[PDB]
Design a protein around this ligand. Structure first.
Ligand SMILES: CC1(C)Cc2cc(NC(=O)c3cnn4cccnc34)c(N3CCOCC3)cc2O1
Length: 283
């Protein structure tokens, strides 16, 4: 039971959708690729209002709402309402004060680096969210650090279910290439591909490096697995130098999970329940 807003009500919430930089007194918070996300106030509740071909975008809008109606969990973003009355699409969520894991890993706008302790809890939280989705027979298809949000306590919240499928190959290959498993690039749809993408997220957590950097060797973060396997680099060479509380044993444990997640044969990867347990044993 979501609150069916009119589009006009959401204009009064968002100051008729004002533009950019929130770090210097603005209201627009960010963009993923499907919509622009605005900060607003419904009574005293802080909200995030996402303003989104038409048929494909309308299908993602309906799929977001359908997934959110079925799936409530502390490690999933909470949808408060929607509006689709006058040929315009909006999604209103509970506000996440600490933004995305990507933003916090990059220390965007002067935020302090995440500690190893906090990074372990974020990894666990994200895995619990993905487990819930998979337990409810949903494939996310776009797991990445930009889609893991963080509340006031840095609890991880999986977001953006527009591309999700309630589980075969597909014609239209979707996802972010730096996170995608080989079989996903070939066009397969499977929960095993979400596991692979989570492996890339775990590498971002360990290293603080972006998943892709055109100005680096190797350009794709997933390729450090091969460097470490061939012993031309070590895990210690890549560990984020913006932490001071990272013990070798637990970092090695998380890397072992990331390595298993990034197995190139899909059927050799752990399922999400095993990933959850391995991260639980790490802590
Ligand atoms: C000002 C702060 C520091 C607080 C804050 C919150 C959110 N997001 C949300 O509050 C939010 C809640 N549900 N939701 C759903 C989709 C996108 N964003 C959200 C985002 N996002 C913008 C879009 O890209 C992802 C990060 C950035 C951000 O920076």
């Amino acid at each position: 039971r979501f609150h069916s807003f009119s589009f006009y009500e959401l204009k009064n919430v968002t100051n008729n959708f004002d533009e950019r930089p929130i770090s210097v007194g603005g209201n627009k918070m960010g963009e993923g690729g499907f919509g622009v996300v605005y900060k607003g106030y419904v009574n005293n509740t802080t909200v995030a209002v996402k303003k989104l071909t038409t048929e494909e975008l309308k299908q993602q809008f309906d799929q977001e709402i359908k997934v959110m109606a079925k799936c409530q969990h502390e490690n999933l973003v909470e949808l408060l309402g929607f509006s689709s009355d006058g040929d315009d699409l909006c999604l209103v969520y509970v506000y996440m004060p600490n933004g995305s894991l990507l933003d916090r890993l990059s220390c965007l706008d002067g935020t302090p680096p995440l500690s190893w302790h906090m990074r372990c809890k974020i990894a666990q939280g994200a895995a619990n969210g993905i487990n819930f989705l998979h337990e409810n027979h949903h494939i996310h298809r776009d797991i990445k650090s930009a889609n893991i949000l963080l509340d006031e306590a840095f609890t991880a919240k999986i977001s953006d279910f527009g591309l999700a499928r309630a589980s075969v190959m597909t014609s239209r290959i979707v996802g972010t290439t730096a996170y995608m498993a080989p079989e996903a690039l070939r066009g397969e749809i499977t929960p095993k591909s979400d596991i692979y993408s989570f492996g890339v997220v775990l590498l971002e957590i360990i290293t603080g490096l972006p998943a892709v950097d055109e100005h680096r060797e190797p350009q794709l973060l997933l390729d450090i697995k091969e460097e470490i396997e061939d012993e031309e680099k070590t895990i210690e060479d890549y560990i984020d130098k913006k932490m001071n509380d990272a013990d070798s044993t637990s970092v090695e444990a998380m890397y072992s999970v990331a390595s298993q997640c990034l197995h190139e044969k899909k059927n050799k990867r752990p399922d999400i329940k095993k990933v959850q347990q391995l991260l639980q044993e790490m802590t």
